[PDB]
Design a protein around this nucleic acid. Structure first.
Ligand SMILES: Nc1ccn([C@H]2C[C@H](O)[C@@H](COP(=O)(O)NP(=O)(O)OP(=O)(O)O)O2)c(=O)n1
Ligand SMILES: [Cl-]
Ligand SMILES: [Cl-]
Ligand SMILES: [Cl-]
Ligand SMILES: [Mg+2]
Ligand SMILES: [Mg+2]
Ligand code: NA
Length: 326
DNA sequence: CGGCGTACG
DNA sequence: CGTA
DNA sequence: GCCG
């Protein structure tokens, strides 16, 4: 079991679901308190269990596994022995955890804003609606659309949605392409949003594309909310039987030279990409982002024609998107 | 003990 | 600050 | 919280 999540296959569904979900509760709570280090450890420990070939049935099977120390092991031990971890349950039902989760789920609200509201005594969504003066335009849209945005986006919604984006993209720049990325590319059947990566086969032709795409989508009456730019975080009108629902849609443009790096980054998972960039820098001395891979000694960028190229340049066995569910 | 990913809006 |  |  290698120490980095990018060094091992992680399938979407696995054999330790209950154990990973408990550790990710503690990771989430750590983030609500600003403890990024503890969040990472609990996330990594959870991911290790996702990568195991069978269920953990005894504590001894944790020996030698990376990122399992006294704390994470005690969590697993109690779940194995009693089916419940007291610390996890105490977090679950705490007013702090429940409210920070409720607030951070709002589009436009992060940990710092939710914490401030919590210290001010706010606890419910209606508490926020009553004092709308303290809300950004982004937060007003997230709060108004919160109910729809809390329902999972279905894979069966995605194809129809990709078609309307492609139509706007094709008018904005003939020859431009739309690629489904994010969780759905990793095989997820549901998602919190839909993530689309846009490019054009002729390097440079994609410059200035996203404003033209957004203007056409808005002209179609499809944009319920959006803010030179290359990333757009929108709220889209998705048809439903006799009606419609609001859905979150992310659009990002990249030049074809950077497409493999953008596809890799936007396909995730989030933990997988953090681990991959950490591996790149700490183990290989290379700097990785969604734009390229930089050698700081030669001061050169590595050209990539595919995701496979990138895995090879980092000395990692290739993992298909379905095995990046860290 | 230092480090914990790295961007854009 | 928010966002991926 | 854990690794190196
Ligand atoms: N902080 C973040 C957020 C996202 N990302 C990347 C990897 C994610 O898979 C991808 C898409 O972000 P995302 O839409 O918020 N999450 P994802 O699509 O994987 O699952 P959903 O929650 O959307 O169902 O961007 C990242 O690298 N760092
Ligand atoms: Cl911490
Ligand atoms: Cl270069
Ligand atoms: Cl990036
Ligand atoms: Mg997504
Ligand atoms: Mg997204
Ligand atoms: Na939020």
């Amino acid at each position: 079991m290698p120490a980095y999540a990018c060094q091992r296959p992680t399938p979407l569904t696995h054999h330790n679901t209950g154990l990973s979900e408990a550790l990710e509760i503690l990771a989430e709570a750590a983030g609500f308190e600003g403890s990024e280090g503890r969040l990472l450890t609990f996330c990594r420990a959870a991911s290790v269990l996702k990568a195991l070939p069978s269920p953990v049935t005894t504590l001894s099977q944790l020996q030698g596994l990376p990122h399992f120390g006294e704390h994470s092991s005690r969590v697993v031990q109690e779940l194995l022995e009693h089916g419940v971890c007291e610390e996890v349950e105490r977090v679950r039902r705490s007013e702090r955890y429940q409210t920070m989760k409720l607030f951070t789920q709002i589009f436009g609200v992060g940990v710092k804003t939710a914490d401030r509201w919590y210290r001010e005594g706010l606890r419910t969504l209606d508490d926020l609606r009553e004092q709308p003066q303290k809300l950004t335009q982004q937060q007003k849209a997230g709060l108004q659309h919160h109910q729809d945005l809390s329902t999972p986006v279905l894979r069966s919604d995605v194809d129809a949605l990709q078609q309307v984006v492609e139509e706007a993209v094709g008018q904005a720049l003939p020859g431009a392409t739309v690629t489904l990325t994010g969780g759905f590319r990793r095989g997820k059947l549901q998602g919190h949003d839909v993530d689309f990566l846009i490019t054009h086969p002729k390097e440079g032709q994609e410059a200035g594309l996203l404003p033209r795409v957004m203007c056409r989508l808005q002209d179609q009456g499809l944009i319920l909310y959006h803010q030179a730019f290359e990333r757009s975080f929108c709220i889209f009108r998705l048809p439903q039987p006799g009606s419609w629902k609001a859905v979150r849609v992310d659009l990002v443009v990249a030049p074809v030279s950077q497409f493999p790096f953008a596809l890799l980054g936007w396909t995730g998972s989030k933990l997988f990409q953090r681990e991959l960039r950490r591996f790149s820098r700490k183990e290989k001395g290379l700097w990785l982002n969604s734009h390229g891979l930089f050698d700081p000694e030669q001061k050169t960028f590595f050209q990539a024609a595919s995701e496979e190229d990138i895995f090879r340049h980092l000395g990692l066995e290739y993992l298909p998107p379905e095995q990046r569910n860290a």
